[PDB]
């Protein structure tokens, strides 16, 4: 048996939220809120144990299940797993405020101890930027690559109410110094004309 | 009230052998199977394996057999789970959950975990996490190539407190983590002065003062 | 494997035959053919559906019985159910080891006994006309052509018109 | 040999009733949490592993009789009786057995105390006028201390006697300490009496009884019970396991000895091959 | 003495395969411990079973014994016990204060009380007293109270209960 499911589904207080699962042969349905043991949410693909609102529900049809949050809360918010033995991957529910913004992007070069290390890292920061969907496509010398780069994303400031990510990739020192210009080409949802911002060493 | 209570946090060496255990609490520990669940830090939940209680018989996954035991003491209506030979990879959190079916059918092929233990941190790692500057505005801290993911960055301690982002822990193919800490800066103060970030990792008993 | 047939002096199954269990390949001028024998597959067919049925007919119906599992330990009566039920286990275990072991020797000889009933029903139709090989395998002594061969196969095999030239080639 | 099973129990052609958390004998007594299992009649009873008790801490001198006349029974029909219980106060509860937000009992059984400060000896009778077996479980109070003895019944040591014209039964109640069980030192002991037709049931009490409220219905037929873990599922089958319905095809089978309904039976080998086919002599 | 339902006792020993006789701390407080008697001569002088505490009265009271033992091990354990049936009322009274003493064992699932009596019996080894000898089986995480106001042919200890391939035999070969 393998399980699938649809991940981080990012979502605003007061909406439904689906979540899917796919088991390939019972199907029960886990929240882990963060920094606490697991929770089960609903038995048997559609049951609901004692304590759940019912705005949580499950729906199974052949051999795909899904997992419905109507009018979600702040508690809600959480990681939800399917189990069936094995589990599913996980899909994070964070919470979703509105407010429209544009990225800051900053480019910071690698410092000379992670060029000795044989772990060249460069690192591309984009500030306050609000839908959190946008993908960034990292170019050196102005050419794309692909599988290096790795994303983390801050969750919700009450104070600005947006969002910010830093992009790094690594390369071996060979590999780095052979490389020109280094630079992350940005693709955005709020900004129209994608931005560059490269460097190089000097 | 239904409770599984567990044991405290244990920090080991790899190579060694650790013993968790699970103690129940409103109900008999016969009446329900027991199930053993890890989740190495961020990675999602992992099922480990299954006692049946009141007859002992157990089922482990293929990756952990041979290298795992589960038994039961009925009189103190506890569990243990015994991880041997202990790998960098296992430092995890440890949940007892509880499962229905003893007789007849093995449980977890058709009942839920209803009730999970608070879990127990098995650590079983130590490592350094190496802070890198980050400058051309904005600056900012990369700290890299630690284990174990708890780790604090402050800056000053008291100093700055917004604009600063804590991007949380990232993997690597080598099994180490990896955050980044930056905070934006007047453009006329990135100039005159600069800022200290302190990284503190308690498993790692570390603490790193370093600036810009 | 009573009689030797199967396993005896055919020697060899057939794996192209799958329109019956038993038949015939015949070979002569007018070229290689096989058929099936239905009477005899369709016998031993029948012989074979049941054949288990016919000692337990069915399986009887128990509702209310004695506990066969104990959590405490009582002493006399506890030990008088478990040793009832053990008894009846063994017995039971008995039964059907016994039961399937003989029925695997008869069907055996069942089937080893078509075959060689068809042998012989074959060997009797060609009273002077053929002499039996020995590797299950029939030398008919004239012109046999495949009408000749399917009335070998009906079982209306005509001996008596060929008999002159039958003899005449066999014993010159 | 049939040696696998689907792991559920088929819920026809047999009246299954799935005991949640509840035991037979608690379902019978009339255990709070057990009140939706009132009335119900059964094929098989399912007791689940899960099963708890959450009333007066009891005790079933031979249970397992009790069990088993019950479950064969197939039914937990119970015809309420007009008892005369006179000079003594009715419906005693306790905070260990709580019903809704107060204190209560067992649905079946009624605690006598004594009114006033007085407990008459109770002689109570009732006839088996009709066709049916009658089954009527009292109950007798061991108490912890000679003080809650005396305060519950003004007695020193009472005495309960269920007689009928063919057997009587007679309990000579304790007063000792007993294992704390759900806040309690004290126990009930459960018996029960099976009235036939034309008989008559006695109760002479001086104290320390659970009197019955009425009377089981006893019946016969093709009642069960079993101890499985197995859920329940909507499907057909003739033959319950312990470990699921299995098909009965096969004329044995190796999944469980413990079996229910048209099963086959049960053997110690795990395969046996029955040859339906002619000796395999393969080419070459 | 004397077993009722001898058989199940001798049965279930004989399954257990082991007589390892655990001794435990009980405390009898106000009664006298050891008791003994000429019928049963240990070394020169009187005796009794070496796994059983004959417990009289002290000085010239017998208070009600309520004792606890709790099973924290994980193997049922088998407590062996007794209750003194005297000869003559006036040894009833001479040994045991009350006139007519009881004994109940009791776990969490089940009870079990004798009330002896005062009678002659049959004249065995010089004595027409009796001891009945019962048995009470903790399985683990389960407790013992023992509850006596008199006649209690107390336990030491407890046997450890096994399963196995053991049995008994009667045979003189
Ligand atoms: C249908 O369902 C039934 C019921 O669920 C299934 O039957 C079970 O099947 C499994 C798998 O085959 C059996 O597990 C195997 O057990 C053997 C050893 O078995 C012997 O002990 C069994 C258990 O005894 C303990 O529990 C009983 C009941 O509580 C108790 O009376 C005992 O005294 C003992 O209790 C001790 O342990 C308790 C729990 O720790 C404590 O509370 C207690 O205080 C004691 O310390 C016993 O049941 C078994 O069989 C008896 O009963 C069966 C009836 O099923 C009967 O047929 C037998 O003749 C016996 O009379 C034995 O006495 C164990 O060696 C196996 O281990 C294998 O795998 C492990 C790794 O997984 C390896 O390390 C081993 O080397 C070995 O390879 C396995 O665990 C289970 O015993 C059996 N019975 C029950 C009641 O569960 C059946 O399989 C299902 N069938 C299908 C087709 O689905
Ligand atoms: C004859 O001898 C027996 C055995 O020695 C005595 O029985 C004991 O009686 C005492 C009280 O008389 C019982 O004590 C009570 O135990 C309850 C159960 O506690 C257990 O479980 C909890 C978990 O729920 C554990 O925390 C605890 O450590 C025990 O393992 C307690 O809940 C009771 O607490 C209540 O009273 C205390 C008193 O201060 C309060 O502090 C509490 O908050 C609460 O209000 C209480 O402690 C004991 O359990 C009995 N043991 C047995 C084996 O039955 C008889 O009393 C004695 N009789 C005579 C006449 O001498
Ligand atoms: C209720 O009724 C019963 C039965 O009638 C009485 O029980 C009898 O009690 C008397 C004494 O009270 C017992 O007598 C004793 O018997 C002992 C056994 O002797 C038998 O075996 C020896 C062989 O060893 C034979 O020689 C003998 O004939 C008997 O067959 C004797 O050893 C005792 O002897 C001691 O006392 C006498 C007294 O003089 C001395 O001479 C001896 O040397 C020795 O010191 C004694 O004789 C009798 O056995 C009991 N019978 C039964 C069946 O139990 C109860 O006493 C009575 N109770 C009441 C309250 O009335
Ligand atoms: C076989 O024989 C039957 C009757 O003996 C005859 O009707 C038939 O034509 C023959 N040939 C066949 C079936 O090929
Ligand atoms: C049970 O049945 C009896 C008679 O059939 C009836 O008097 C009684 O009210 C019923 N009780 C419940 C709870 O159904
Ligand atoms: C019997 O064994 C127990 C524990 O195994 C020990 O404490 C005791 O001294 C032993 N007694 C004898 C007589 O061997």
């Given at each position: 048996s393998v399980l699938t499911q649809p991940p981080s589904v990012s979502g605003a207080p007061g909406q439904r939220v689906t979540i899917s699962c796919t088991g390939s042969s019972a199907v029960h349905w886990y929240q882990q809120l963060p920094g606490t043991a697991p929770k089960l949410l609903i038995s048997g693909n559609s049951n609901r144990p004692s304590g759940v609102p019912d705005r949580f529900s499950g729906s199974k049809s052949g051999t795909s299940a899904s997992l419905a949050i109507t009018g979600l809360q702040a508690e809600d918010e959480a990681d939800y797993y399917c189990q069936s033995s094995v589990f599913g991957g996980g899909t994070k529910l964070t919470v979703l405020g509105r407010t429209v913004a544009a990225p800051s992007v900053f480019i910071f070069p690698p410092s000379d101890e992670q060029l000795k290390s044989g772990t060249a890292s460069v690192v591309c920061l984009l500030n306050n930027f609000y839908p959190r969907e946008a993908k960034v496509q990292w170019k050196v010398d102005n050419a794309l690559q692909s599988g290096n780069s790795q994303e983390s994303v801050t969750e919700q400031d009450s104070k600005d109410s947006t969002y910010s990510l830093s992009s790094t990739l690594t390369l071996s020192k060979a590999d780095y110094e052979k490389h020109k210009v280094y630079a992350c080409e940005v693709t955005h949802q709020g900004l129209s004309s994608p931005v560059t911002k490269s460097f190089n060493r000097g | 009230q239904v409770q599984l209570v567990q044991s405290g946090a244990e920090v080991k060496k790899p190579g060694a052998s650790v013993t968790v255990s699970c103690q129940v609490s409103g109900y008999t520990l016969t009446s329900y199977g027991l199930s053993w669940v890890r989740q190495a830090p961020g990675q999602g939940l992992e099922w480990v394996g299954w006692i049946n209680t009141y007859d002992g018989q157990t089922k482990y996954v293929k990756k952990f057999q041979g290298r795992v035991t589960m038994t039961t003491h009925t009189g103190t209506n506890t569990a243990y789970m015994e991880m041997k030979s202990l790998r960098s990879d296992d430092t995890a959190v440890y949940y007892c959950a509880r499962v229905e079916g003893v007789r007849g059918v093995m449980g977890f092929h058709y009942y839920p975990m209803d009730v999970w233990g608070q879990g127990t941190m098995v650590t079983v790692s130590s490592k350094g996490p190496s802070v890198f500057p980050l400058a051309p505005a904005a600056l900012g801290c990369l700290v890299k190539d630690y284990f174990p993911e708890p780790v604090t960055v402050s800056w000053?301690?008291?100093?700055?407190?917004?604009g600063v982002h804590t991007f949380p822990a990232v993997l690597q193919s080598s099994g180490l983590y990896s955050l980044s800490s930056v905070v934006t800066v007047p453009s006329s103060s990135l100039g005159t002065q600069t800022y200290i970030c302190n990284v503190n990792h308690k498993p790692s008993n570390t603490k790193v003062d370093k600036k810009v | 494997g009573l009689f030797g047939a199967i396993a005896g002096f055919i020697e060899n199954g057939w794996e192209?035959?799958?329109?019956?269990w038993y038949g015939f390949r015949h070979q002569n001028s007018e070229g290689t053919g096989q058929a099936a024998d239905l009477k005899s597959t369709q016998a031993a067919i029948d012989q074979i559906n049941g054949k288990l049925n016919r000692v337990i007919e069915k399986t009887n119906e128990k509702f209310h019985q004695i506990e066969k599992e104990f959590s405490e330990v009582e002493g006399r009566i506890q030990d008088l159910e478990k040793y009832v039920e053990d008894t009846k286990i063994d017995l039971w275990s008995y039964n059907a080891e016994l039961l399937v072991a003989l029925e695997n020797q008869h069907t055996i000889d069942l089937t080893d006994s078509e075959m060689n009933k068809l042998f012989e029903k074959t060997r009797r139709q060609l009273r002077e006309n053929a002499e039996d090989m020995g590797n299950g395998c029939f030398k008919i002594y004239h012109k046999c052509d495949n009408a000749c061969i399917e009335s070998i196969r009906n079982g209306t095999y005509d001996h008596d018109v060929y008999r002159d030239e039958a003899l005449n080639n066999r014993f010159q | 040999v049939q040696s696998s099973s689907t792991g559920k129990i088929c819920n026809n052609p047999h009246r299954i009733l799935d005991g949640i958390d509840c035991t037979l004998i608690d379902a019978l007594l009339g255990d709070p949490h057990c009140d939706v299992f009132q009335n119900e009649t059964w094929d098989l009873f399912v007791e689940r592993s899960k099963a708890f008790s959450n009333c007066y801490p009891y005790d079933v001198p031979d249970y397992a009789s009790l069990r088993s006349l019950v479950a064969s029974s197939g039914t937990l029909e119970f015809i309420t009786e007009g008892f005369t219980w006179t000079g003594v106060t009715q419906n005693g509860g306790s905070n260990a057995c709580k019903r809704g937000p107060g204190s209560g009992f067992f649905s079946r059984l009624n605690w006598l105390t004594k009114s006033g400060s007085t407990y008459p000896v109770l002689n109570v009778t009732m006839p088996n006028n009709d066709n049916f077996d009658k089954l009527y479980i009292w109950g007798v109070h061991h108490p912890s201390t000679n003080q809650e003895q005396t305060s519950l019944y003004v007695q020193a040591s009472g005495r309960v006697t269920v007689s009928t014209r063919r057997s009587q039964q007679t309990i000579i109640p304790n007063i000792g300490s007993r294992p704390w069980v759900r806040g309690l030192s004290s126990r009930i002991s459960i018996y029960w009496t099976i009235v036939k037709p034309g008989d008559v049931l006695v109760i002479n009490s001086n104290g320390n009884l659970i009197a019955p409220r009425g009377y089981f219905k006893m019946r016969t037929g093709k009642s069960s019970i079993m101890r499985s873990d197995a859920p329940i599922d909507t499907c057909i089958s003739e033959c319950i396991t312990p470990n699921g319905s299995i098909p009965?095809?096969?004329?044995?089978?190796?999944?469980?000895?413990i079996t229910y309904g048209a099963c086959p039976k049960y053997v110690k080998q795990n395969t046996l091959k029955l040859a339906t086919g002619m000796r395999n002599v393969p080419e070459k």
């Open positions: - | 000053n301690s008291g100093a700055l407190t917004s | 192209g035959m799958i329109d019956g | 009965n095809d096969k004329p044995f089978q190796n999944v469980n000895k």
